[PDB]
Point group: D2
Chain length 256, copies 4
């Protein structure tokens, strides 16, 4: 078990990658904080994860927090220190991807995605990093960006820069927090059959073409990101910081 | 001269890389629109540059437009429309780098760098692209990103995401704009001796440290970015889009 | 323990990164095949390592196989077949780095680095992959590339192409082997204090220069590469293939 | 005109990218050396280029040289110094790509591609770089690698590592030759409708699918690489070394 006493903050853990990451952390011994949207969907799924975690002997807390609200980071660590006394791992997973054309992009739609995926993340890692610094025992930070941090997307001109900015954030934060033992890394998932990609997969017309492009012959599911995220949060990656890791089943390298 | 018919909009052309790029384009026959801060230090530099190219057979205006103000997009478009009739090349260069440590980064200063380097660039590219599509004659977009789009900066945790997002924006835009003949590329300059780093480089015991890391043996000057920017804006790059071009004297590869 | 049933072939496991990786896999329950130089300095290290893991409940043999000799592929396969019955994980680690300047690089020494690090790796991966396909149970390939696969080295113009080709080989192999359940990934270690750079790091006035470039504040040790190699070889990386994993303490991103 | 006195060595310039690069160099004032395979195809096409160059007032020489023959580099510079007195630019374009499956790759087929695309290139850049060094006036080196230096290819496990090795070579050579003004860069063309891709395009079944993936809406032709190569050889790129440049019409960023 890899996080036997580390307490892990996972944002946007209602469903998708964030949910499966928080669950596997508890299975490795972590004391998870299940952050969510503060919506009733977020509140319900988080309790479900919290209830499922204690079902096999784990412990966790559900805390609502809007990633666009720049005060959510310090509230999430404040809930984590009040509940478990320390902040050791931050999985900044919260984000949105509203597909939209570029030349007619609304200013509000763009600024809501930059604030949620980038700006809100910047102050969640900041509030978390501070706690790891004055704790003096190090820590791990994992940002969930995208394969789109390395390529483009015609309907994601407002999305891919936030994901490439999350990667770059982990690169610079790796330098600023390096001397304090705080390693910062990014996971770049490929096509994960989640709710963000539901509108495309609900067509089931090019899902067969989506799967065709993945060399592993299948789409990703949230538990594909659980293993890599807890690896980056563990002592198995003690010398890993400023790195990205593609979790895409070969999608990136498979040129056609 | 490789920009004869073209009309070029260069943001942040009052000083630094933007000035040299706007100067070299006009010597290649271009009709330049040197946007600037709206400052009178920026207006004088633009007007001086305008007079400079006026002295040997070039054309240029000067349009004060705050990049943090997203209306500046349609402002610089209409100004290049109402004086030159077309917009054929956009060089998005306006950017700030206020060196500051990560854990005590003010919200105000961080939003000021995101809005000035990324948000204002998105809608500046969007506004310029809408004109290129409406004309139906193709075009070229060039974003001045940075070597910091591939590596980190301890005092630039607020800065490197904007440049990395500038890169990713060029990638996603090259897809959405490709079918319309609009090429979008990023130039990645290394350490260039400008006023973005005048104080940062006046250590006088650390400048030569950065200088010894450049295999070419010298720091950059804004004229070194002029050649690569006109090339990417020229027909020499007819099949070049969605690409990045390191102009760093070998700094990135020099694993010193 | 995450490699219970698996059988691991580790080239160049007599010393350095290969030894630590072969040691950690067996503590994860693996049946290790520590290939070595055929040297008696390599045989003793392998036999010592074999006895080391034999001391706390592990299994291992020792197979002398020159990586420059491309028959060594089918040799290490048959040796793992004729003793353990299967080959499930291949860690291609054997490599030389004979520091030498570019313009006076002998043909013999250059071909010796290409053949040992790349050519012998290609057919070692090919031979191991043929067994994984014939079994039809999937598998994992892990190539020890380098941070030098993304940056340059003035005294490694013969060395960095082999590591960059090792990266690209993992990408192309992840496509051809993906449908057969065979994942192929590269680990990119930074500056690791081994005997590949004992003389290069004994300047004693340049070691701390490289050390100050690592944000984590220390050079690597072979045990730092053990965690990432077993992870990529484990089911934690079920959806990870064609990926690279920087293990450098932040060296790559630290634009010092 | 960008190379008004520079003398340019282009290898494998019979047809394809190498031919169109040598021709555009002459149109920019260069004194070209048209290297070719030494076959009768190579001899014929080279004379045709040489005859076509002098048709518009240029000057050039045809020289046969096998890239697999490691002595071809010094012979190519020896012919260039005997003909024009200096070596200033080296476009190492020679290479092959025999498509073949991985698990049944012949040792001879692999070693002939590593020797032609990588090993032969390493000593062609070496012989050329030496001349630029003792000339003391600098120079430019351009290696034609591939988009496959960044991705994979199922039928190119023997090909993509040589192309990624060519990139890495330019990165390390940029460091070793930096202090001597010798800039080394790589072009990464995408899908160029040449003879290497003829067997796929002669099917014309997925050529329509090949074009579908390119955002510029068309395949590449050799003159798409002429502009970028002469840019990298000119004073427009005086601060550009250790860089790669994608010339693919957006193919790399267009994820599907
Ligand atoms: N869909 C993919 O395949 C894919 C690929 C690469 C990266 N990502 C990224 O992974 C992350 C998870 O997305 P997903 O695939 O699990 O789909 P998802 O719809 O399940 O989103 C995951 C979580 O983000 C939460 N969230 C959204 N906005 C929030 C806000 N302001 N505050 C707090 N929580 C918020 C949601 O409530 C949800 O729980 C995203 O950031 C996404 O950009 C997804
Ligand atoms: N010089 C370097 O080392 C370096 C390295 C990497 C990237 N860059 C980038 O190069 C680009 C060129 O700038 P520079 O740093 O070379 O010279 P500079 O810093 O001296 O001037 C930057 C320009 O940006 C303009 N500008 C600043 N804020 C603006 C605003 N709100 N609205 C409109 N215009 C504004 C200014 O008018 C100015 O001319 C920058 O965007 C920078 O991010 C520079
Ligand atoms: N230590 C570093 O700084 C560093 C950095 C980047 C990459 N690497 C790579 O890590 C890998 C591990 O080696 P190391 O350098 O860490 O330790 P090392 O240099 O002390 O030993 C290298 C291993 O390779 C084996 N080997 C060498 N030549 C061989 C041959 N012809 N045939 C069979 N085996 C042979 C040796 O038995 C030895 O155990 C190397 O391949 C190296 O390219 C190391
Ligand atoms: N086909 C593509 O789209 C593509 C994409 C990326 C990179 N490349 C690379 O560009 C280069 C040019 O290939 P191409 O697309 O023009 O097709 P091509 O068939 O025309 O090959 C170009 C030249 O390479 C020459 N050549 C081959 N082997 C040689 C040898 N031993 N010695 C001397 N010359 C030799 C050939 O005679 C030919 O003139 C190649 O190295 C290729 O790997 C091609």
């Amino acid at each position: 078990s890899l996080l036997i006493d580390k307490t892990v903050i996972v944002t946007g853990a209602s469903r998708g990658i964030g949910r499966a990451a928080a669950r596997e952390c508890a299975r490795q011994g972590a004391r998870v904080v299940i952050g969510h949207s503060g919506s009733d969907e977020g509140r319900a799924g988080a309790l479900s994860l919290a209830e499922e975690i204690a079902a096999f002997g784990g412990t966790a807390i559900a805390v609502g927090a809007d990633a666009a609200d720049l005060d959510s980071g310090e509230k999430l660590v404040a809930a984590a220190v009040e509940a478990f006394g320390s902040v050791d791992v931050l999985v900044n997973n919260a984000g949105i991807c509203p597909f939209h054309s570029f030349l007619d992009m609304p200013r509000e739609l763009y600024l809501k995605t930059v604030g949620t995926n980038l700006n809100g993340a910047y102050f969640t890692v900041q509030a978390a990093a501070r706690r790891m610094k004055e704790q003096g025992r190090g820590g791990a930070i994992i940002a969930v960006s995208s394969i789109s941090a390395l390529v483009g997307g015609a309907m994601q001109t407002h999305y891919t820069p936030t994901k490439a900015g999350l990667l770059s954030l982990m690169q610079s934060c790796a330098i600023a927090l390096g001397p304090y033992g705080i390693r910062c890394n990014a996971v770049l998932p490929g096509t994960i059959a989640t709710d963000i990609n539901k509108e495309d997969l609900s067509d089931l017309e090019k899902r067969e073409r989506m799967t065709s492009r993945v060399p592993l012959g299948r789409l990703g599911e949230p538990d594909d990101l659980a293993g890599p995220i807890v690896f980056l949060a563990s002592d198995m990656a003690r010398y890993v910081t400023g790195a990205s890791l593609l979790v895409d089943g070969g999608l990136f390298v498979n040129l056609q």
